[PDB]
Symmetry: D2
């Protein structure tokens, strides 16, 4: 196999750039895919009852043609993200609609408009080829990838690339994602691999760490400062496992919300002290399908004040959506910020605008991160200031079970996936820095 | 009263010096529009609509209050009747006497406001007569208007933007000695210089809705308007929206004005706007039923906006109607744009589709009234002739009851003013050249 | 002649995109060029004595090959600015040095490394062909260009592309510039042509306009708001003339500084009213080569207050540098901003920091403009809020004389160049908006 | 030592006086204070600033109590500190403070109380409220307080969106009278903050001025707006401002590059948690080659040394205050897009820099000055929470304030130099012993 020869080169440890440039490309690669003819297979079911194991296929797919500004990457490991779940249950809409619309832009984007969709929005691996116009990256470079896909032909994105009208998420709104043995990315998605981490560890921060960085740290989100109090929903999940770290390292005080004593213990291991278990408290923010209960908003606010000495939070880190959003707006301090990048429990938000306008609060929408933000987030991992939060690793063939874990909220931290890597534990080339941080690196491990 | 008449004579002469005002003997009573503590339940049982301010508002002669540190006594030439004045006059949401009594427990200074009568009114235009201890920047004779937000600023919270202060009082509503009277008492950090090209009644008009619109649309605490922006303005001929339309035009931006009648569209054209949507003629139905919205109506509004902008979506939505329009407001905003909100007239339980907010990196910014720097800047743009008052009708002080009913029942398209000491309309202009340049717009809301 | 038929299509006014796509390309185009062998010809001379008429050639050159994300444009008009003049006299160094070094990177970048250099960093014209991947532009589109190109391989420029470490000015650090019948640009340099302007007027605002927009209007510079008072140095020059217009269009008050009565008249024709003639006032901000005179800073401040009713300016629009900068910091209001994008009179600035910290002022550096700011500035021209400042137009064959005119500061406004356009005055397709603004459009004629 | 003053101190020291007990104490008719005299403001004319001796101009006087006004408090001062503005005052540089008092005195009959032939100095205090004026409801006799030094009238609209912008804004004890280097002081009640209970009187007095300033300059959005990951060049990292700036950089998750002039100060920086330390004396930087011209080669040498510590990165922020000597280098070494934030010019206020580095690299120079009440509250809250620690090195008696000021004038100190006012000895005033115990090693990091 051409693919076995590629893996052997990576595992040897002493292949030069010219060696990678000399390997023959395989004619197909193994990939986790959706099929277009199945996009209605879950019609009539409740979201909970839609099973990613039924929709996710392991296929052999042809290599796409390499274009200008792009790189072909040999993927050692990837991760399950919530967009992998959304894709796999075809909610809110089918990703094939996104691929069809993308394919209308040009003959190059039309490569993506296929009857199958290779998923995955994270990777760690090795560059094999680069297209025309690519100088910064070369075959053999060890990389991780962020998932922003921007074309930058329009002027709109030249003062923050998230504002590009053609901005997409790689592996979700584009094809050739990371849950596969090979991937195709733009080279402006590439970042240097953290040397003290294994392949699966290095693949795990990309998406959620970059998003948490823009949403909480950067001036394009909440602009955290030391001394702030920050309410962090889902503090032991993917986003929250990085948000909590940024709050603590930035000198702020996180109030972490989780739903089990096991996750509460992890938050204490990260260094948080103020932890609310929403299951034990039994919050019912909605009385029925159409009306909320302000008494329950107020009970949450009172519990926060027990931890802060009577202070309300400067920032709410939102993402659960409809269930929690009325409470989030209510409990925020006068002049404070609710920053939101998601709506897991439902995107039709309801809130009492009297609390927003009379208290001069703001709701800031945030979405992934631009390259500069993704670089800064990955830099803090490489410096050993922010740590990966991997809890469990699955084989590529078992990506469906990994997606079901997240779908049903059975996990903590990040769930990783081995792609070409034959086992866990490979890829560390800075053992001294790894040993300095190993206890924190393994804090989420089962 | 002889002393009061001599004060008015000094003002009307046009050439009294500061020393002359300092030498005028103060009156020992002044005429004022008041509520009476004994009557606060006279409307119990009735619907808001059927409560009549002519039955609760009294014309009384009241004694002058003692002038404290950092305060000014003002001879009032004109004032205004706004929604806060109307609600007070019908003891809604609760009687104003409740707060005057509680706050009056703090100190002998706060207890001056706790009286069996309440002098209403949160606007004035007039002349400073006396200042209390420590005052530097104002002197007898200075011609002034007032910002009605009073802050004590003992908490640190308000020292980077005073709207964050936790202890605000609206003068004439949560304080006594308001402006619907011949004299008023205010803090000197409420005073603003009178625009010289306007009459007394015009200068008292812009008031809180003008500074609120300025903070919401122009200032960096709100939307931070820049030239070239497209701005969707709901209620563009009402209080807030009329000033927002003017700020958009004055700042080099394009307002897309929304109104509900052809008469209102004509007022918008008179202010200088060109892109006008009649929401009633278009028949928008943003809610399908009590609990669900219709995204195809959001998109129909979006397509109508694009007809005026050459295919562009708005950088800013100037919100205030609330529940009925808020879903559409979030939908139509450009990627990276801002929805600024300072009220919820149609209902405060907002519902919107958050996918549009996070996937297009939009933000919803809450704003409320204005701090004193914003009020100074808004008033300064009126004084420069960039922003014009919106007066429709003027009443004498003796007829404040009817003025209040007119506002309560929405009888006029623009503001209702009240003459206090001024004997007739049309006095107080000392810059006729500037007035002549802007006369048509100044009178756009007169019939 | 294939070139003649391209011009006839443009002049017909009703060719469709399919008609442009069907036209045969010419094998060569007429271009204004420098020659590699002559780069030492002005060795020994003072700058003022170098004559661009001796170095600029009119050549027929072959068409370059069209790469990914590029467009081939038929050029109706161009401009001559200071970058063009500097290149034509090989200052500060010959432009061929950078073209050679950059052309080592790849076959794409080596297209630019030729023995001749086609100059010009402005255009107005019609798209003829686009390279692969191009979505937003098609044959027939009427365009102007933003001259600053970025590669954006580094993350640094992905929150504001001016932070990118590898910028190139098209026609100066690239070949195939706009002083020619055809040009090659990236598609993320293209902007829609303002319909109410002639070809030569549309090509004129260019980089000084977008630089002024970034410095004064955008949040990356001073963040102007209506009501502000703005001190504008050099108010009838390139930057200052656009800055004056942005101040007015944004509802602010420019306090315009000029050095002659004729310049004051031009400021009044633009709409300004508060004008200071620094030469009539006789300001001497420096007492000698090393020390300033705070009494003269204060004298300027007092003159400003005569126009503002006693207020100090919220913003100073700086660019003269050493001579004026101490005065600029002094006169700015408490909490105000001094924004700077050049140092004409000298880059070693000196100022009294007590005024800066005790009055919480800031000095903000700005440079050129990113593509979003260039689009917004061009859009305000297209709205008729901002007007071009052309003084004189030359034919392409006379580009040498045009460059000498700019080099010796012969005109008060800009110098334009007809490329394919056979005469001035063509290209207006919005005559109603033009008629509204004709007097201001011609203020520098 | 008068009887009424002795009775006030006995009440404080008893630990159990009630608010009504302080209200009932007789006030003294005079108090002991460190003062300047108007007749002497020319005494150093023609001398180089280094040769001006604060021991010659600072007097210990008995002065009459001023009349209490609306919005004010009379405070019994247990301890204060020397600040550099105490040094500036005592050498009448750049100008005499009596010009400031004369100008202030023209505003109103209330501000005219300050226009006196002597100037009571001091811009920090820790102590106990004795009396409050009209309009004061938030503070009462007996409250244990520290004071920040912002004096704002807030009559003008300009200060109502950040009070530092008030046109009449002044620094208490420098541009106003009745400062804190004295047994009693007069302040606006909007200068008052709750005393941190785990600190002694002298420790609690020491952060106010420089900690508030460093917070606005580095942490707040009105200054540099620090974020975790930033590299920050901190001049004078073991002095007053620097000893707080370094703590904010570390606690905010940034990397300070600390500049000091001795190995002893380098060791304190390491004890604070910094690793990247430059000794400007050992490096021998000569940024100026003569009176009128700088040396870009030395700017470059500093920039190269910084890059050795950061792995090749240039600093996002420079925390400036030395002024003329360093400012050209500070602008040069800053990263593209970065910020130089300045609140002072110790070495000379006529700054010179190369504007090509500022405009071509899109840098900005942000002027900062003290802090508004909200920022001062936030800075003091972080001390009270034990997140930021006092940096007191040495304590002098009130009668030795002249020598304390000379220490700072000649750059012989580290951290903050404290002064006992009414407090009879060091070590008093702690009422949270368990929080103190948790943090004691860091609290004492600067002690001789
Ligand atoms: C892990 C990474 C990350 C990720 O993976 O993300 C995440 O985990 S995140 C959570 C997962 N992600 C989601 O959960 C949501 C997926 N995505 C969607 O759910 C839909 O995508 C959305 C609701 C956002 C929009 O859907 P859509 O219905 O497609 O939107 P819209 O209406 O904007 O556009 C269609 C037509 O409306 C026109 N149009 C637009 N604006 C106006 C206007 N103002 N006026 C008039 N017409 C207008 C356009 O011009 C078009 O016209 P056409 O071009 O002729 O079709
Ligand atoms: N815009 C963007 O770019 C990004 C958006 N997202 C979106 O953010 C959301 C979370 O992503 P991720 O963190 O990766 O997923 P995870 O599932 O790993 O973390 C989600 C956490 O949310 C909490 N949670 C779930 N449902 C509720 C609820 N109804 N009420 C309160 N808390 C709840 C759980 O914590 P517990 O049960 O312990 O309280 C869980 O750990 C998803 O919707 C995802 O699509 C993600 C990343 C990028
Ligand atoms: N808290 C306080 O102290 C005060 C609060 N307020 C609040 O501010 C709000 C606005 O103030 P102001 O502008 O002075 O009020 P106005 O009554 O002057 O104008 C309100 C406009 O809102 C528009 N509007 C109302 N309902 C809807 C709707 N359902 N959909 C769309 N547009 C609508 C109408 O415009 P059209 O019909 O022409 O489209 C109406 O003219 C007030 O309604 C009140 O709630 C006001 C003053 C004081
Ligand atoms: N880096 C680059 O690639 C480019 C840099 N630049 C730089 O930008 C600067 C300005 O560009 P532009 O506006 O187009 O130049 P202009 O020549 O068009 O206008 C410059 C104006 O500055 C004013 N000025 C010059 N010297 C002084 C002085 N000592 N004191 C006061 N005012 C002075 C004059 O106005 P008046 O005499 O009327 O008061 C003069 O008109 C150029 O001078 C150059 O340094 C420009 C082009 C490109
Ligand atoms: N605007 C405001 O509100 C405030 C302004 N200031 C001003 O800030 C400055 C410092 O205040 P503070 O920190 O209290 O004083 P300190 O003397 O305690 O600290 C100053 C430090 O600067 C360093 N330093 C002194 N001179 C030079 C020089 N020429 N070059 C380089 N480094 C130098 C020394 O460190 P080393 O020798 O170890 O390098 C010294 O420790 C003063 O000018 C003061 O007035 C202070 C506080 C508030």
């Amino acid at each position: 196999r051409h693919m076995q020869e590629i893996l052997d080169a990576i595992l040897s440890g002493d292949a030069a750039s010219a060696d990678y440039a000399a390997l023959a490309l395989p004619e197909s690669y193994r990939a986790v895919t959706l099929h277009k003819g199945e996009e209605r297979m879950f019609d009539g079911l409740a979201s909970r009852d839609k099973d990613p194991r039924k929709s996710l296929h392991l296929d052999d797919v042809p290599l796409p043609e390499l274009g200008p500004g792009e790189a072909l990457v040999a993927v050692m490991a990837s991760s399950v993200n919530y967009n992998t779940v959304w894709s796999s249950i075809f909610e809110p809409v089918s990703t094939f609609g996104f691929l069809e619309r993308y394919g209308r832009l040009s003959p190059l984007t039309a490569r993506h408009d296929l009857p199958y969709h290779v998923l995955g929005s994270d990777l760690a691996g090795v560059v094999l080829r680069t297209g025309a116009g690519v100088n910064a990256w070369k075959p053999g470079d060890e990389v991780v990838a962020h998932c922003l896909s921007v074309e930058l032909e329009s002027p709109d994105g030249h003062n923050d690339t998230m504002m590009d009208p053609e901005q997409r998420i790689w592996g979700f709104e584009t094809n050739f994602g990371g849950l596969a043995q090979l991937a195709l990315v733009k080279t402006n998605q590439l970042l240097p691999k953290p040397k003290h981490l294994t392949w699966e560890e290095a693949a795990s921060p990309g998406l959620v760490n970059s998003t948490a960085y823009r949403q909480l740290v950067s001036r394009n989100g909440a602009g955290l400062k030391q001394g702030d109090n920050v309410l962090i929903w889902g503090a032991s999940g993917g986003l929250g496992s990085y948000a909590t770290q940024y709050a603590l390292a930035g000198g702020a005080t996180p109030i972490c919300v989780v739903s089990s004593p096991r996750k509460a213990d992890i938050c204490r291991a990260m260094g948080a002290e103020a932890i609310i278990d929403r299951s034990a408290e039994g919050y019912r923010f909605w009385k029925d399908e159409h009306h909320q209960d302000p008494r329950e908003w107020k009970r949450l606010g009172g519990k926060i004040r027990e931890f802060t000495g009577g202070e309300d939070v400067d920032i709410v880190f939102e993402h659960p959506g409809r269930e929690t959003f009325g409470a989030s707006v209510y409990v925020t301090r006068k002049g404070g910020t609710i920053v939101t990048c998601a709506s897991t429990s439902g995107y039709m938000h309801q809130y009492d605008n009297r609390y927003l306008w009379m208290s001069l609060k703001r709701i800031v929408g945030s979405h992934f991160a631009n390259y500069r933000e993704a670089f800064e987030a990955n830099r803090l991992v490489a410096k050993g200031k922010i740590h990966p939060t991997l809890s469990k690793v699955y084989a590529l063939e078992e990506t469906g079970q990994a997606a079901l874990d997240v779908h049903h909220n059975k996990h903590q931290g990040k769930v990783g996936v081995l792609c070409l890597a034959p086992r866990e534990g490979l890829g560390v080339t800075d053992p001294e820095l790894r040993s300095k941080h190993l206890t924190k690196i393994n804090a989420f491990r089962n």
